[PDB]
Amino acid sequence: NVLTVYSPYQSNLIRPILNEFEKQEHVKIEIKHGSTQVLLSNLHNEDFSERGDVFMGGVLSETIDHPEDFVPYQDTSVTQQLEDYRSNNKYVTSFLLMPTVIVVNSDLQGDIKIRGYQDLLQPILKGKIAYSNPNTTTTGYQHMRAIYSMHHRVSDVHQFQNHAMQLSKTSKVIEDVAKGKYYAGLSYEQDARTWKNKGYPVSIVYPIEGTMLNVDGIALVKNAHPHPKRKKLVQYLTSRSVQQRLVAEFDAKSIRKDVSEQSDQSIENLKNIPLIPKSKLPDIPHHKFLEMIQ
Amino acid sequence: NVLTVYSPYQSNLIRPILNEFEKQEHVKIEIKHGSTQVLLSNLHNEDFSERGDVFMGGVLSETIDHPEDFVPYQDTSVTQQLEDYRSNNKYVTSFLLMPTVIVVNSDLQGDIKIRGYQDLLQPILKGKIAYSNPNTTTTGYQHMRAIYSMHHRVSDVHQFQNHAMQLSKTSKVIEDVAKGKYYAGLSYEQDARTWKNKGYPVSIVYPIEGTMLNVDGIALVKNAHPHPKRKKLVQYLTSRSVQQRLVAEFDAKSIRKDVSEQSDQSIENLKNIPLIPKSKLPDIPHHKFLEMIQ
Amino acid sequence: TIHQHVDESQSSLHHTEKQIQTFITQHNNSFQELDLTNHHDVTATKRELLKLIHQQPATLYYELSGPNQFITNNYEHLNTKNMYLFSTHQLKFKNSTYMLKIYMANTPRLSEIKKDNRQFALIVDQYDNILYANDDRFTIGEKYRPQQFGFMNESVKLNHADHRLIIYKD
Amino acid sequence: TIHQHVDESQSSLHHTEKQIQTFITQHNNSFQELDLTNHHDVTATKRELLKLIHQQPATLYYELSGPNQFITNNYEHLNTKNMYLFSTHQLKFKNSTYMLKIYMANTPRLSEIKKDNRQFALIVDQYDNILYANDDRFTIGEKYRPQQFGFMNESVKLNHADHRLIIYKD
Ligand SMILES: O=P(O)(O)OC[C@H]1O[C@H](O)[C@H](O)[C@@H](O)[C@@H]1O
Ligand SMILES: O=P(O)(O)OC[C@H]1O[C@H](O)[C@H](O)[C@@H](O)[C@@H]1O
Structure with a gap:
């Protein structure tokens, strides 16, 4: 039934x-x-x-x-x-x-600049960035591809992972950013919008270096x-x-x-988002890519 | 002042x-x-x-x-x-x-099919189609191009012009089709919506063969x-x-x-219109085209 | 016991629903002659509505909405989202059509066993959507799953809709 | 004459506007204590509004709008798009803020000269937008271009706005 x-x-x-x-x-x-x-x-x-x-x-x-x-x-x-x-x-x-986005706590942001993956590497933001386990979630994995696709350097993926806290669940990222436990996080459009609409100090950033869709x-x-x-x-x-x-x-x-x-x-709207073209879109399959960034 | x-x-x-x-x-x-x-x-x-x-x-x-x-x-x-x-x-x-469109009187249409420029050439529609002078108007000129861009035959333009009544003003086409003096006409979106919102029996057709934007x-x-x-x-x-x-x-x-x-x-919406791509868009300048087809 | 309380509440709401049908019928021939822009006829509708509210034991709130009119006895403006939507009607009122919603906030029987027996109530439709709860751990509009459900309970179908009244103990 | 009619109309509209401002001032210390969901206070607002309408030779219609309330003396539901908008106010009414629009549909004087003399009236703002016309050739919201037409006319600025009253013939 x-x-x-x-x-x-x-x-x-x-x-x-x-x-x-x-x-x-x-x-x-x-x-x-x-x-x-x-x-x-x-x-x-x-x-x-x-x-x-x-x-x-x-x-x-x-x-x-x-x-x-x-x-x-x-x-x-x-x-x-x-x-x-x-x-x-x-x-x-x-x-x-569904765009993947960076969510920024605008109460904590102050004057720090966050317009992409590269800005998330400012040493001031060390330990204050959250993302979800790329092995288990669509969001973490799609963000790691986007980080990788910037200059196609596995060193960029590792530099971020050393710089940020990994969380078990995607929905925990926006929750804790929204409540002021992290300056920023790697999330997706709908979950950020959900919390922005409840009143939380959440800014949605589409990474300039290339937004994964x-x-x-x-x-x-x-x-x-x-x-x-x-x-x-x-x-x-x-x-x-x-x-x-x-x-x-x-x-x-x-x-x-x-x-x-x-x-x-x-x-x-889609035509105003800086999306990664099909051109620069990494190729390697899922399991392959995950083993590569381990 | x-x-x-x-x-x-x-x-x-x-x-x-x-x-x-x-x-x-x-x-x-x-x-x-x-x-x-x-x-x-x-x-x-x-x-x-x-x-x-x-x-x-x-x-x-x-x-x-x-x-x-x-x-x-x-x-x-x-x-x-x-x-x-x-x-x-x-x-x-x-x-x-601004899409250029074909406007169809749905009271007169009956079972005649009008899905693009070729259908306008059905002998049953001879003398019952209106368009505006391509020498003086943006709308007539842009429609002639699109007609030409179907199969890139100047014979298609002439076959239409022999099949239809030329008018002095673009706005006279929609008015006379809307009021039931012509079965269909060539016009533009924004002037067809205008007449359609006043209650007239106006159908807006985006030609399949190709729509000039x-x-x-x-x-x-x-x-x-x-x-x-x-x-x-x-x-x-x-x-x-x-x-x-x-x-x-x-x-x-x-x-x-x-x-x-x-x-x-x-x-x-734009993505659902059958637009003429950059590809099939004729290349000839304004005055050249008017002289070619006259 | 629980089985007694479901029968009596199932019977009280049937009687309650029965009285609302009678209201709507009685005044199909009365409301068509009233204009709700006229302050004498508004009083005539309020008097009839409040009479209905108090001919039965449940705590009921009416909402009569339409063109530039909102009429209710929810004077403290409690959130209807937490109340059982119980019936809806389109009434012809001479000047226009008005929608009448009847909400049930509580009944004296469910309030009693909740206090004395710690027996709580749920009303759910055939798709297990929650339509009423007086237990804070369930919220209307969400779902109740009899899997995670681990309580003593008896249930009964209500006569007026495809809904089920569940009284359960914690 | 036409020149006499514009002076008299300008002075009459000035007196009219003068009375509207007096109304809003007086009753500010009377509204903040009125509730428009109460039928005794609504009656009190209508009485004061209708009292104002009839201290004036001009034919005026009020629209008092807000949360689930629309109060007006436009009982035949005439289209306000054809009327002159005279003023607009936001009034504090204890329960909420309500917007009050005053419309001028005609004046006994303009109606009289149009009937007896075929002298029509226009009101235009500083950008030539037509705000009032009793001549069917002109329509509100469109532009008045004096050069397109040849008329006898006298015009005057109205005190309450950057508007010009034009009375003309031919
Ligand atoms: O926890 P997850 O596996 O990431 O599920 C959440 C996912 O829902 C959608 O499918 C979105 O397209 C993903 O961007 C998002 O990540
Ligand atoms: O065709 P005309 O008489 O020159 O009028 C021209 C009008 O219709 C055309 O299709 C253009 O898309 C419009 O920008 C323009 O307002």
């Missing part, structure tokens, strides 16, 4: 729209939360007959080390998706665009008895009206051509 | 924002209206001492046959403009993005005693707050990176 969904997203983003799907299709949806790679490992070791049905969130097209645990599928709506972010992976459908995906999980509504769920999440949702109510960046962006405050 | 502005824009678009400039800078602004090339010709013969100060509207970067009538200038804001539409002409600053410009007119507020006007029209307004209040498509588009109701 229950349609189970793995997601690294915070509840405040997905629970409301999945609730709307429960009411529309008369289904019960359970969410299993956790860091991206923790879910993928727990899932891999999970017995076929106890596996959930759907994986949403994370950069799935780039960090699934076990393709056999998923069912190939792409929705009919890829036609309406932005050309540059359509998935070239038969297990993953593109769902959202996450293309979040949705993937069907291979299990014994897949829920009959799970392909309706994927079409639903990629639908224009739901995307128009993610845009209006949550400030999300839609994957579709026909959904416009939203004039929000202190959140930039 | 009075700051005079030449513009082919309809009053309902520029009059409100120029009004806001009048009582922000304590200036009187007069608008001289007319078809793009008619204004440019009348301006050329006008005495230096009797010329206005500013020209706004029209595809100025590409259809000024007399550069000597203008002052070189570009606002400091070009840095914030979209890279692909920044003016590479030293007399023109880019100001707006107009980059409207602003240029300083060379005169005897330029108005001291005229450079402040150019900076005002390219400011973010005014663009945001044009977006919010008129559904215009902004030239700036940092101004997001607005949401639907028949005006597609």
Whole structure:
């Protein structure tokens, strides 16, 4: 009866729209939360007959080390998706665009300059920067690629890791920066915006040297008895009206051509963000890269 | 004293924002209206001492046959403009993005299909299509280019001109299609939305074969005693707050990176329009093209 | 005991809901002749609403919203977000249509067992969304999962909606 | 004559504006103690507002807007876009701030000369924007270009704003 969904997203983003799907299709949806790679490992070791049905969130097209645990599928709506972010992976459908950002505590910042990864290396900021374990999370790993892609030097990744505190969970970074335990941290757009809107002294910085953009995906999980509504769920999440949702109510960046962006405050539109082009975008695969920066 | 502005824009678009400039800078602004090339010709013969100060509207970067009538200038804001539409002409600053469209009367259309220029050539539509003089208007000229750019055959332009009724004024096309005198016409977004918002049975079609996108410009007119507020006007029209307004209040498509588009109701967003790329965009200058097709 | 308290509360809310249907019906022929821009007819609606509020034991707050009117007995402006939304209605009021929401903040029976028995209450829909809680550890709008649920409880369906009343002990 | 009509109109509007300012001053020490969700205090505001409307020959409509309140004497719901906006005020009303707009729809004098003499009226600001017109050729919000037209006219500046009253013929 229950349609189970793995997601690294915070509840405040997905629970409301999945609730709307429960009411529309008369289904019960359970969410299993956790860091991206923790879910993928727990899932891999999970017995076929106890596996959930759907994986949403994370950069799935780039960090699934076990393709056999998923069912190939792409929705009919890829036609309406932005050309540059359509998935070239038969297990993953593109769902959202999510900038990775530096979050700065504006009460603690004072006159220190933080406009990128290089500024995070100012010795005054030593021990006062937080980020999440790149082995377990999409956020830490995507930031390490961005740090690596600056001048393609593994020394830059290590200099940052020596300079900053590693945390177990992505959501702990913005929380502790927001509350004044760290001057800055490496997070993503939606989590920063969430806390900025609650009133915390949070400034969102898109690194000038090159901002990494996450293309979040949705993937069907291979299990014994897949829920009959799970392909309706994927079409639903990629639908224009739901995307128009993610845009209006949550400030999300839609994957579709026909959904416009939203004039929000202190959140930039994509065309004003200094993104890393596909050109300078590191190549090495996930496991390879992680072993390289160890 | 009075700051005079030449513009082919309809009053309902520029009059409100120029009004806001009048009582922000304590200036009187007069608008001289007319078809793009008619204004440019009348301006050329006008005495230096009797010329206005500013020209706004029209595809100025590409259809000024007399550069000597203008002052070189570009606002400091070009840095914030979209890279692909920044003016590479030293007399023109880019100001707006304006799709050229086909407007269809949905009361008359019936089951006739009008998805682009080729469909306009159905023999059933002979004598029931309207367009504006390509010699005098930005709109007729830009449509002829797009027709030409389909298959790069001058025979397509002539087949259309034999198939359709030419009118003197761009604004007469939408009015007469809107009121049911013509099945369809060639026009521009912003004038079609205008008539559609008044309740008329107007359908906006972005031609699949390819949609010409107009980059409207602003240029300083060379005169005897330029108005001291005229450079402040150019900076005002390219400011973010005014663009945001044009977006919010008129559904215009902004030239700036940092101004997001607005949401639907028949005006597609840019990424969902079938635009003619830089690739298939014909190369020939203004006067050459008019002579080629006449 | 718990099973007694669910029956009596399930029966009290049915009686309560029953009285609101009767109100809406009785005055389908009465409200169509009142104009809420006129201060004599506003008094006529308030008198009828407050009469309803006090014909039953639960603590109820009404919200009557519409064109430049907001009418409620929530004088201290308690957050309705923490109250059970219980019924909604579109009423024709001659000058326009007004939405009537009835909220339940508490009942004297649930308040009693909470104090005397430490028996708390939840109301949940068929998708386990929480629609009412008087225990601070659950919050309306979120979900309740009977997995993590480790208490003694009896549940019953309410007559007026696809909702379930759960009384549980800690 | 036309010159006499502009002087008399200017002086009448000046007296009118004068009375509005008097109203707002008086009652500042009367509003801060009134609550507009209370039907006795709303009646007190209407009585004072209507008292002001009728100390004046000009036909005036008030709009008092705020949190879930709209108070006006425009009972036939005439479009304010065709009226002259005379003033605007923000009043402190104990429960909240409410905006008061005063509109001038016509004057017995301008209505009379238009009927008997075909002498029409315009009010324009310093940028030639039309703020009032009883001639169907001109519409509020657009520009008055005197050179496009040939009329007899006399104009005068009004005391309360950078506006010009124009009475004209032909
Ligand atoms: O804890 P995590 O694995 O990083 O989950 C949080 C992730 O949610 C989304 O998918 C975002 O695209 C990621 O940038 C973000 O990091
Ligand atoms: O076609 P005209 O009579 O010259 O009017 C020209 C108008 O429509 C064109 O399509 C341009 O995109 C507009 O910037 C201009 O205001």
